[PDB]
Amino acid sequence: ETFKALKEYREGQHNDSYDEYEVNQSIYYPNGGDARKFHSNAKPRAIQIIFSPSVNVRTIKM
Amino acid sequence: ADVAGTSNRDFRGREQRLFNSEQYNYNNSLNGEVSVWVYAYYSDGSVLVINKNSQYKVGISETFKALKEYREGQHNDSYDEYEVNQSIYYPNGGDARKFHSNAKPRAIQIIFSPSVNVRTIKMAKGNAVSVPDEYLQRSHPWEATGIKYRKIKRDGEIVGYSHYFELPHEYNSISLAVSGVHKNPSSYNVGSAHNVMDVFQSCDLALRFCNRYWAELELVNHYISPNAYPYLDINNHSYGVALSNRQ
Amino acid sequence: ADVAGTSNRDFRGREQRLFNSEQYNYNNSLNGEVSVWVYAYYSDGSVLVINKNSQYKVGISETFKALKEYREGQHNDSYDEYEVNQSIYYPNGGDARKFHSNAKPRAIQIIFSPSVNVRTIKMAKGNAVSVPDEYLQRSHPWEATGIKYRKIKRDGEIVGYSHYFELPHEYNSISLAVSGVHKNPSSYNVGSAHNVMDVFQSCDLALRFCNRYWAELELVNHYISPNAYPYLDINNHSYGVALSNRQ
Amino acid sequence: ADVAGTSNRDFRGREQRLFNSEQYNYNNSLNGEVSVWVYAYYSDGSVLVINKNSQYKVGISETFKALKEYREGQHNDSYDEYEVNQSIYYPNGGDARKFHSNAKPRAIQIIFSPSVNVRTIKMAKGNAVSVPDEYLQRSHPWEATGIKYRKIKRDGEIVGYSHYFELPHEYNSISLAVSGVHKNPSSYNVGSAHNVMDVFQSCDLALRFCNRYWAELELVNHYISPNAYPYLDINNHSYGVALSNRQ
Numbered sequence: 069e070t071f072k073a074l075k076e077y078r079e080g081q082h083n084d085s086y087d088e089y090e091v092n093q094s095i096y097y098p099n100g101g102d103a104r105k106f107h108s109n110a111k112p113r114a115i116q117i118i119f120s121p122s123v124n125v126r127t128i129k130m
Numbered sequence: 131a132d133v134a135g136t137s138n139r140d141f142r143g144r145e146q147r148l149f150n151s152e153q154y155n156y157n158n159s160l161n162g163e164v165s166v167w168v169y170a171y172y173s174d175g176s177v178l179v180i181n182k183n184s185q186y187k188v189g190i191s192e193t194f195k196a197l198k199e200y201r202e203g204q205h206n207d208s209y210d211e212y213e214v215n216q217s218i219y220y221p222n223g224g225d226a227r228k229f230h231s232n233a234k235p236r237a238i239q240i241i242f243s244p245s246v247n248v249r250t251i252k253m254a255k256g257n258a259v260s261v262p263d264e265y266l267q268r269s270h271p272w273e274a275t276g277i278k279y280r281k282i283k284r285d286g287e288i289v290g291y292s293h294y295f296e297l298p299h300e301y302n303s304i305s306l307a308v309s310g311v312h313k314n315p316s317s318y319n320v321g322s323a324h325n326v327m328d329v330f331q332s333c334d335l336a337l338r339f340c341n342r343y344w345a346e347l348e349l350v351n352h353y354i355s356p357n358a359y360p361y362l363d364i365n366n367h368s369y370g371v372a373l374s375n376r377q
Numbered sequence: 378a379d380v381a382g383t384s385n386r387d388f389r390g391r392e393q394r395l396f397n398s399e400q401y402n403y404n405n406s407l408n409g410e411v412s413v414w415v416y417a418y419y420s421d422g423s424v425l426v427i428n429k430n431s432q433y434k435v436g437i438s439e440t441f442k443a444l445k446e447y448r449e450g451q452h453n454d455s456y457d458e459y460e461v462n463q464s465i466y467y468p469n470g471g472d473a474r475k476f477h478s479n480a481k482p483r484a485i486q487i488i489f490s491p492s493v494n495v496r497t498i499k500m501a502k503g504n505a506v507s508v509p510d511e512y513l514q515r516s517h518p519w520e521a522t523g524i525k526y527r528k529i530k531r532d533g534e535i536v537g538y539s540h541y542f543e544l545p546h547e548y549n550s551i552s553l554a555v556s557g558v559h560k561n562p563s564s565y566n567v568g569s570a571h572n573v574m575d576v577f578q579s580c581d582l583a584l585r586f587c588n589r590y591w592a593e594l595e596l597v598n599h600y601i602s603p604n605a606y607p608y609l610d611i612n613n614h615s616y617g618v619a620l621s622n623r624q
Numbered sequence: 625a626d627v628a629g630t631s632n633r634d635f636r637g638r639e640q641r642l643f644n645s646e647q648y649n650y651n652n653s654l655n656g657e658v659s660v661w662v663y664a665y666y667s668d669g670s671v672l673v674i675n676k677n678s679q680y681k682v683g684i685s686e687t688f689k690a691l692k693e694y695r696e697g698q699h700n701d702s703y704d705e706y707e708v709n710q711s712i713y714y715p716n717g718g719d720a721r722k723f724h725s726n727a728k729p730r731a732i733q734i735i736f737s738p739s740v741n742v743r744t745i746k747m748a749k750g751n752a753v754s755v756p757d758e759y760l761q762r763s764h765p766w767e768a769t770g771i772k773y774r775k776i777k778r779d780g781e782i783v784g785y786s787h788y789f790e791l792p793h794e795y796n797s798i799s800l801a802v803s804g805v806h807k808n809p810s811s812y813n814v815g816s817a818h819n820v821m822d823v824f825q826s827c828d829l830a831l832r833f834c835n836r837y838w839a840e841l842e843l844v845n846h847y848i849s850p851n852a853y854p855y856l857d858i859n860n861h862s863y864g865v866a867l868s869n870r871q
């Protein structure tokens with residue numbers, strides 16, 4: 069997934085879509101955007117990766 | 131004339147030092163202001179500041195709702211946020227479409243000006259329905275929290291006092307009021323009969339300010355620093371201007 | 378050990394009774410809260426509650442406009458409601474598209490906590506432009522209405538005091554303020570010079586709460602009952618919790 | 625110590641040169657990335673970039689619709705643009721209110737990193753319904769276009785490879801996929817049985833990036849240059865960073 073694809077998207081609700089384009093520009097290059105917020109609450113705060121028991125753990129790559 | 135910075139006849143230097151010393155001491159006289167600031171920090175990095183400036187005594191009191199982030203001229207999920215409030219006032223009392231409102235404060239910083247007497251500070255940190263301690267019947271209406279205030283210092287001078295507390299847990303849903311009295315080392319009680327109606331007028335004359343700044347950088351640059359206010363940032367850096375006996 | 382509920386050594390029972398008695402008496406000490414609630418009832422069955430909790434004395438003051446129903450996050454006919462207000466402030470002064478605004482309160486209930494002294498209660502029930510009695514020049518700024526307050530009782534104990542008045546007529550357009558002082562059977566005046574600056578701080582520390590609940594059932598279930606507040610419903614049923622000398 | 629820039633003991637200089645040489649050669653080892661970029665140029669001067677970075681082999685495949693300009697958070701004539709698409713998929717098949725959609729790309733630039741083997745590059749430039757050459761039955765699924773790629777050079781070093789083609793005609797309505805394999809001058813086949821499951825994992829681990837920049841200046845300043853990517857602008861100016869045996 070891309071940086072953008074992992075950001076929170078609320079289906080059928082407002083998502084500050086224009087400001088969030090500007091947020092993305094500021095994250096891709098420092099000072100590259102014109103957003104109206106310091107930190108987007110759509111950015112993930114954490115990630116958990118889980119595999120089923122049929123994986124071989126030594127093959128996992130990230 | 132004597133040469134600058136070489137003798138006791140540098141009257142420009144003596145006047146500069148008195149000008150600053152007079153500002154510092156005027157603020158601490160009974161004719162001066164006492165000020166308080168409440169900073170509510172939001173997860174989007176914005177900060178609501180509420181300031182009250184008044185003679186003799188000063189304070190701020192806000193509801194749970196009033197401390198929540200409000201973005202002027204932008205969408206604020208206003209209907210869902212009513213439902214969030216209902217769920218915070220009573221568990222399972224609302225029908226919101228979110229587990230945690232990002233409008234709830236993540237932290238609070240209370241700052242007083244150097245003219246407060248720290249031993250007079252009182253705080254009522256209530257629950258979301260504005261009760262100080264679980265039930266009204268057993269609630270003392272405030273807690274004297276002065277002992278927890280840190281001195282904000284610049285060049286060795288106290289420029290203000292800070293109490294900071296984070297609200298990182300889901301159950302940290304508060305109402306808040308805070309109060310402090312202007313220093314008064316004299317035995318002239320400002321609230322005794324001679325002057326009590328002036329203290330009543332001070333309740334009317336207190337000036338309030340409130341605004342949401344987008345970042346702590348913006349708060350430092352355009353709110354704290356231009357007005358010579360004291361502040362303590364997330365990196366524990368102290369801001370303010372030392373005035374006593376200084377040029 | 379002795380068997381429960383059979384002797385004078387049931388310390389768990391003695392401690393339960395003291396725990397409740399202490400809450401009741403703490404509320405009535407000068408260290409306790411005094412609380413007031415204003416309930417504004419609307420024709421859609423919703424109820425606005427405004428609560429203020431403070432030491433020493435407490436009150437609420439609202440304009441005609443502020444008491445009108447406001448549905449958060451829903452349409453409120455905001456332009457027509459400005460025109461309604463103009464027509465209420467002066468007859469034929471507005472251009473509204475309705476004869477009677479359903480946002481006007483149909484009734485008001487004022488409740489005080491049991492720590493108030495009923496003889497101190499004062500109410501300023503003004504007209505729509507915030508004048509207590511027709512013209513300012515002849516207005517006394519309040520009326521002492523304590524005699525009209527009914528005791529709200531539970532298990533024989535006074536849990537609160539209620540004054541209720543309906544506003545069913547087209548001309549019942551009011552502004553409203555109410556005030557009460559905490560009981561003080563002592564001869565220590567809380568506002569004498571020794572303690573007057575603490576009363577000034579109490580003005581700053583008072584906590585306010587306001588919310589619109591959709592029904593009296595919802596108010597009873599999620600506002601009154603969870604917080605052990607006193608209430609009187611439309612069927613004259615008293616709500617609250619008796620604490621003095623009770624388990 | 626010896627003086628800088630005067631002898632064979634300038635270890636800081638030798639380490640700087642090795643640091644750059646190691647980056648250049650690591651990229652070209654089988655442990656390194658192979659990257660491709662597709663730039664779609666629009667008449668409003670904006671540019672969509674799609675990048676894919678992966679080990680062993682890499683590619684991008686997009687539909688006619690996916691290459692059309694999409695302005696995030698702005699109006700995009702979305703209903704008329706569905707009708708435009710219907711008219712492009714079959715002549716006279718739609719009901720659009722425009723002759724030429726300004727969302728169609730005016731040009732395409734394909735760039736590969738210097739770790740690609742140019743002889744492995746393949747492109748499927750299909751029609752608007754995703755058929756490579758008029759009809760499926762007679763379509764070879766790609767064309768090996770390596771011979772047309774220009775070297776992008778900086779300080780005499782190849783920093784990347786470019787194929788550029790304009791789409792200035794009304795009939796230039798395409799779908800597009802492109803693919804290249806990482807250089808492998810060895811006789812260890814990365815897709816032979818020993819390592820083929822690592823190539824399958826590389827299909828999963830490939831990282832994609834896509835964004836629309838407002839101008840070629842902005843692309844150069846904030847996309848190409850900060851990331852040390854190769855690029856060729858409309859004035860035939862080459863961008864990139866030479867690393868082999870350089871300080």
Ligand SMILES: Nc1nc2c(ncn2[C@@H]2O[C@H](COP(=O)(O)OP(=O)(O)OP(=O)(O)O)[C@@H](O)[C@H]2O)c(=O)[nH]1
Binds near residue numbers: 296299301302
């Ligand atoms: N711990 C706790 N406090 C609660 C709860 N519900 C309400 N509170 C209030 O939360 C306040 C304490 O909050 P915190 O100091 O942030 O929580 P903590 O458990 O002490 O944890 P840390 O301070 O983060 O180490 C109390 O004064 C209570 O009034 C609950 O579920 N747990």
Ligand SMILES: Nc1nc2c(ncn2[C@@H]2O[C@H](COP(=O)(O)OP(=O)(O)OP(=O)(O)O)[C@@H](O)[C@H]2O)c(=O)[nH]1
Binds near residue numbers: 544545546548549
């Ligand atoms: N009766 C009356 N009161 C008015 C009028 N305009 C304003 N008022 C105010 O209305 C208040 C009395 O209202 P109500 O008690 O609800 O009316 P009421 O005539 O006594 O009738 P009921 O109480 O329903 O039996 C007074 O205190 C006035 O300030 C008017 O046209 N008629």
Ligand SMILES: Nc1nc2c(ncn2[C@@H]2O[C@H](COP(=O)(O)OP(=O)(O)OP(=O)(O)O)[C@@H](O)[C@H]2O)c(=O)[nH]1
Binds near residue numbers: 790791792793796
């Ligand atoms: N010339 C032409 N090509 C068509 C037409 N319809 C579809 N095509 C496609 O267009 C491609 C060629 O496009 P271009 O190279 O841009 O056109 P060109 O006629 O060669 O003209 P220039 O390159 O501008 O000199 C072919 O590969 C076809 O698949 C049509 O009407 N005319």
Ligand SMILES: Nc1ncnc2c1ncn2[C@@H]1O[C@H](COP(=O)(O)OP(=O)(O)OP(=O)(O)O)[C@@H](O)[C@H]1O
Binds near residue numbers: 281286287288
């Ligand atoms: N209540 C006060 N108001 C104003 N200035 C004060 C007050 N108390 C002390 N000061 C002065 O402020 C300066 C700093 O003194 P302070 O006691 O805060 O520093 P410290 O002893 O180094 O640190 P700390 O006491 O915080 O551990 C001194 O000039 C002191 O005289």
Ligand SMILES: Nc1ncnc2c1ncn2[C@@H]1O[C@H](COP(=O)(O)OP(=O)(O)OP(=O)(O)O)[C@@H](O)[C@H]1O
Binds near residue numbers: 528534535
């Ligand atoms: N001001 C007060 N505050 C608290 N408790 C009170 C007060 N006045 C009386 N009580 C107590 O409250 C209880 C009820 O007394 P109260 O006089 O209200 O009842 P009553 O005489 O049956 O009814 P009422 O007087 O309303 O006709 C008794 O325990 C009484 O001692």
Ligand SMILES: Nc1ncnc2c1ncn2[C@@H]1O[C@H](COP(=O)(O)OP(=O)(O)OP(=O)(O)O)[C@@H](O)[C@H]1O
Binds near residue numbers: 780781782
């Ligand atoms: N496949 C390749 N990968 C990396 N470097 C290469 C490759 N082929 C040649 N080089 C090197 O790149 C540099 C430029 O050589 P190149 O043949 O591109 O230049 P040229 O002969 O001046 O121009 P051109 O061949 O494009 O007409 C030399 O150092 C050459 O050894």
Ligand SMILES: Nc1ccn([C@@H]2O[C@H](COP(=O)(O)OP(=O)(O)OP(=O)(O)O)[C@@H](O)[C@H]2O)c(=O)n1
Binds near residue numbers: 081088104697
């Ligand atoms: N940095 C920003 C953010 C917003 N806006 C303007 O504010 C409008 C509303 O903001 P937007 O980010 O699109 O939010 P919403 O409309 O509330 O939500 P959504 O678009 O996801 O439905 C936009 O159309 C845009 O014109 C802007 O000028 N600059």
Ligand SMILES: Nc1ccn([C@@H]2O[C@H](COP(=O)(O)OP(=O)(O)OP(=O)(O)O)[C@@H](O)[C@H]2O)c(=O)n1
Binds near residue numbers: 209210225
């Ligand atoms: N718990 C919720 C939240 C929202 N909605 C519906 O979704 C609509 C849009 O949501 P709202 O919370 O009001 O957000 P915005 O309109 O996006 O923002 P704002 O109202 O602050 O301008 C509301 O009118 C309401 O009908 C709902 O039914 N239940």
Ligand SMILES: Nc1ccn([C@@H]2O[C@H](COP(=O)(O)OP(=O)(O)OP(=O)(O)O)[C@@H](O)[C@H]2O)c(=O)n1
Binds near residue numbers: 451452457458473474
């Ligand atoms: N007496 C009135 C009432 C309404 N209107 C017009 O009707 C529009 C809609 O009415 P409004 O009272 O504002 O109601 P809503 O938009 O439905 O609700 P709200 O504004 O509270 O969201 C207004 O903008 C105004 O132009 C008017 O001309 N005269």
Ligand SMILES: Nc1ccn([C@@H]2O[C@H](COP(=O)(O)OP(=O)(O)OP(=O)(O)O)[C@@H](O)[C@H]2O)c(=O)n1
Binds near residue numbers: 702707
């Ligand atoms: N060929 C077309 C183009 C537009 N419309 C009508 O015009 C409206 C507005 O056009 P649209 O193409 O959707 O553009 P915008 O709303 O301006 O932009 P977007 O939808 O991307 O936000 C559409 O809802 C549709 O009803 C139509 O009937 N036939």
Ligand SMILES: [Cl-]
Binds near residue numbers: 159160161
């Ligand atoms: Cl003084």
Ligand SMILES: [Cl-]
Binds near residue numbers: 406407408
């Ligand atoms: Cl007491």
Ligand SMILES: [Cl-]
Binds near residue numbers: 653654655
């Ligand atoms: Cl290798």
Ligand SMILES: [Mg+2]
Binds near residue numbers: 084085086697
């Ligand atoms: Mg939008």
Ligand SMILES: [Mg+2]
Binds near residue numbers: 207
């Ligand atoms: Mg809304």
Ligand SMILES: [Mg+2]
Binds near residue numbers: 454455
């Ligand atoms: Mg309106």
